[PDB]
Amino acid sequence: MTRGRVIQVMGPVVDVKFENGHLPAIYNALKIQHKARNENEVDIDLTLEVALHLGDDTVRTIAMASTDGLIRGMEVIDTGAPISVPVGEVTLGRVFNVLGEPIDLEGDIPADARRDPIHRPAPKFEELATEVEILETGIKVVDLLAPYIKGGKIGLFGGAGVGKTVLIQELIHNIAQEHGGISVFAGVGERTREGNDLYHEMKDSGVISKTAMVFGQMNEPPGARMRVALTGLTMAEYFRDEQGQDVLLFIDNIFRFTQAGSEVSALLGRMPSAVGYQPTLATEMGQLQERITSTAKGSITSIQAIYVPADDYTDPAPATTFSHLDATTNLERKLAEMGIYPAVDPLASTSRALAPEIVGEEHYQVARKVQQTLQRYKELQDIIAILGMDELSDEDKLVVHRARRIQFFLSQNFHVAEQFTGQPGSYVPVKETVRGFKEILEGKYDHLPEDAFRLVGRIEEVVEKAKAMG
Amino acid sequence: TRGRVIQVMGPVVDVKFENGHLPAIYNALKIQHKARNENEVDIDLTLEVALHLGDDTVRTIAMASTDGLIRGMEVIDTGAPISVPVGEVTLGRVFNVLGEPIDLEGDIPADARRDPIHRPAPKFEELATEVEILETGIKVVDLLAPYIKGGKIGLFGGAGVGKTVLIQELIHNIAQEHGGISVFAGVGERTREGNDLYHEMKDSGVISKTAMVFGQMNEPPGARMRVALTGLTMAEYFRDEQGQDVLLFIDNIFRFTQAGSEVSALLGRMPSAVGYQPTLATEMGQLQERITSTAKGSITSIQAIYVPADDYTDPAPATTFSHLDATTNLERKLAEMGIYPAVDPLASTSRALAPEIVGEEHYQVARKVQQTLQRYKELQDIIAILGMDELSDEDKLVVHRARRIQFFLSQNFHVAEQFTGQPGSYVPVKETVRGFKEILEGKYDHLPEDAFRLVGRIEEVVEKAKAMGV
């Protein structure tokens, strides 16, 4: 259709003037392709997302790529639809940018692929289902004390250097190894080094063929880092709507999504609010987390990680995301620096599906007794520090004796630790977890040295390690 | 050529040069008007250009009171920046911002040299550095944070903490001994302090080696802004063309940035920080960068910095902290405790506190004193929460010696003879280190704490204990 001409450049923000008056709608996509006519000019290819109308046929757009080298008077062409990521079977085992173009050198997606507009109206009330199905991960702590739910949103909270990315990566591997379901990974402003290391690790694991990845790099304008999660969600959307199966969606970090929203608002000229945040925060978070709903056909379960800026669970982004979670697992630096891997705090991690009728009564009883012993140990440690373990009476002695072992056995080696410590790793099904924890609770292994429990999987591995140590 | 005034808003005036010629930035303009009728007021004013506008319009900062200005008056163009008379003639005399003399003693003829006030700073190759200690006779500075010849010295404190007492004591002690030209430039300080210091210098006879320029706080912002630059201009000639060592004393340089913000609000600059103008760091860096010691000559500068609300977090003190080789911070709590001066032992440290510069024994004594004072600084909190009876024997000894050490740092001063009626003392460095070593080794266990209060030498401590009847 008719061309439009640039009028202003203010960094990421650009303005266009469609003289004839046939304006594009909001959230549309605009394409800039230029070839230098003189030796002074540059060649640029740019994608622009409309955000506002300012009257007099002028529109205000946010750029998805660096705007350096723009010239006033150059023509802009309108696509007529939002940024359309290609979807289908062609997107499995590849890496894409926010625009849906392949970052990998393995090839270019052809025109044959069907394209899904990223921006789409949400599912309605009548469609949604309410049934609850548990997802088994094979991790002792997660399966025992914080079950995850199909279609539900699961949050991972913690500080820096505690293993959230290791947990999410090893969970992806475990799910693809055992359950075999499709998965999609969205990197919102991921470290290029960490993205490349993750790509190489998954390629070595043979998992890439089953999954799909999209990356929005930190050195890109904030709008692309905002829209990358939505394009990943559109990939999972097409998989769930047409293939009708249990898709999973992993998101690297929502914190940078909120930050990108704040930056785009500041650029657009909207008044700040809360702690410098954009005026429209709750709405955007709500949309991103309400398009992820389990209909009758497919779940679109999500696992999401969030960083706590100053160890305070009060920043607007963590609170807004906190309002939306079915299960929350928070990681502590003290556990990470201890020998206990993974670093998951039992007491502060909860799931609303831990009700006795959902998981079974035996699971509920064992989990409750585990937490009771942990609380008694935490209370008794203060007395132990000053007066020692000998001062307390026999019941407290037995309680702490079991508690140390339970804290140790909550740990296990996993396949991703091959890089870091060279151990193969183990996979424990839920029934083996509850059996082992019931056994250690009842105390048939009081004679065993505590060191046998440190990083093994099944309890017979405790027996084998006790055999090895002597 | 003349320009017509069209606007006036407090300190700011707006000249329009419709003749076809425009003044450059920093140029000086002259206003001279004769009252045509009894309603009009005779006015003499000077305007410096600070900004430019489209229609030949220029915004100018007024150097004096703007009352009585009428639109349509004509402004004379000098064609050059504010010129200051500098040379040998300046010694003894007192000048205002424009360079006019203040004292009724005489006038400056046309024969005298006058040079502009604005110029670029010295380059990298001209600078030189040395580590020579500059003894002050003050126990705190000498023993815990020595000043250096040719090094910038900064005094930080709030209102009513003892800042000016240090300025006068240092000026007395060093100006009595050093054969260097001194330049004094009070920035927005009390005029009574200037008059008293003038009388004191006339008593000391140092006025023949001194030149003075004053900007009063009641004077409009422009004078408080340019007065420090004028004093610096005079010190510049004395440093370079004469090739003589010069000392530059400035009080509460913060008023410079305060006046800058006063006029910046009117200049139309968007707000920033805590109301501070956006261009804070550039201007303050320009002024501080011009105060440098080269191979041609050296400048030993001692300045004082006002803190708006006793909180060092404010952007102006924070920016100033980067431009100082030696800093002593004054704390109101020490003033309330009665310990004088108010220099905090645990936040003042010069660039010269190195083992090679000061000697091994001096460095070791300084660091052991600092360690003990930090230990007491945490012990006081421990005492507040737990009590003073739960401390260990060695902890009791640590507190015991910490009290005496913080008390001994107080010194009877010279200028305080007026305020309290004590003689005053000048303590050599060797006496300081020897006394501090003696108390650190606990040779004076028997003496009471009060005997260490406000004394020069440890022998005076012994004499005071004798007076106590110990």
Add this chain to the structure above:
Amino acid sequence: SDVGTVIQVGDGIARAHGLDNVMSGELVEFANGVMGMALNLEENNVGIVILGPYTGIKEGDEVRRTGRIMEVPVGEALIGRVVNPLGQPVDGLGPVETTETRPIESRAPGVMDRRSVHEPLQTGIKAIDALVPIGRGQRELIIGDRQTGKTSVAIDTIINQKDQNMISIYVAIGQKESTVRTVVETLRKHGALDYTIVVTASASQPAPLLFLAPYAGVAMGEYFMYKGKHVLVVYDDLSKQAAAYRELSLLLRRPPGREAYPGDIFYLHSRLLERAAKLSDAKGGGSLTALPFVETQAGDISAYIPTNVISITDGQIFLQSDLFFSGVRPAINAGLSVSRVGGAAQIKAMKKVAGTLRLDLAAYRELEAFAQFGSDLDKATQAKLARGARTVEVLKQDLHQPIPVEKQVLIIYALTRGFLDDIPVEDVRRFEKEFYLFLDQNGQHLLEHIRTTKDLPNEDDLNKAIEAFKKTFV
């Protein structure tokens, strides 16, 4: 047309008519000869920032565009020199004579160009080398309050850099020139100057030079890493860079943000820090590691800029004046310091010993917090307290005295296995140095085994050497 008049002048900013073919970021030149960058294009005006002394410009002056983007001269001859953000010497000694030039605005190496970080970067500081390792390509942040022994860490690592074939660029932003001279002299007297490049941006230089300084820093390291050599880059202050960008944005009338910062701050800092990488073996194997510095008031590392930089970096070193005046120097907070390359960027013996060292320090960190109040305790608590005290005691080291890695691992092995039990705490500092001298004279074979093998020597030889030294000490 191409020619246009200036319609406003002020505070290093101008506005111009015409210039209808200008490009964002294009260099533009005035009649005065000063240079500037066009940054804002409006419906009938252009927003220009001036890279130099601007006082001479007047209304009606004609301004014309150069037609190019700013390029930093690059060459092998820059090493040892002191240069501006622009390619002009400020050290005297005549022209530097570079080979050619590179644009500052360039794209970063993406995925499938990099590789995992596997080779260490030696600093010679026992605490950071043992508990917070750094490897080539790692973007390690250092943050703290004023005058807390920050720059001593970078200077020590640059001095120790003599061991490894790395250019160590030092970029100073917004600082006093006399500090630049002092640090240059401190480098030169220790002989490190010949493999170093210093870039100086004065506090009084026009702000756009401070805006462009870090890019001029990365340009040379990028050229060297393209050539295949290892590079280390140090920024002495990002906070002044943020202040300069805030000032230059606010003068342009761009809308403010959280703390009057414009909307582009994170974009700018990510653009700067994303060029640091570790190129793959195919590209040549170069590396561009960075050690940015951030200044913070009262240790409120939760402020806007520290949060941005800590979310961009791969680790932090938290320095506190509390530990500094506590007698523990350099004042590094082990608990709050994290590095996400911890296991890969160390030699095997360093990993083997440092794991147990970190375990002991972690236990002591919690026990000491309140064990002090109780005078009388059971023996094993006393043992753990003594272990932690000796642990912290050993870490103390002299300034400008980097230690070779092998002596580090030997003394840390002596610490971890409890060989220092007999030694009273005060004697430990003399024990470390006399132990170094004794191993230099007698136990050289251990050092030979470590330097050749890159692994811990046989247990019997190390034990015999350590006990043999322990025999002499009193």
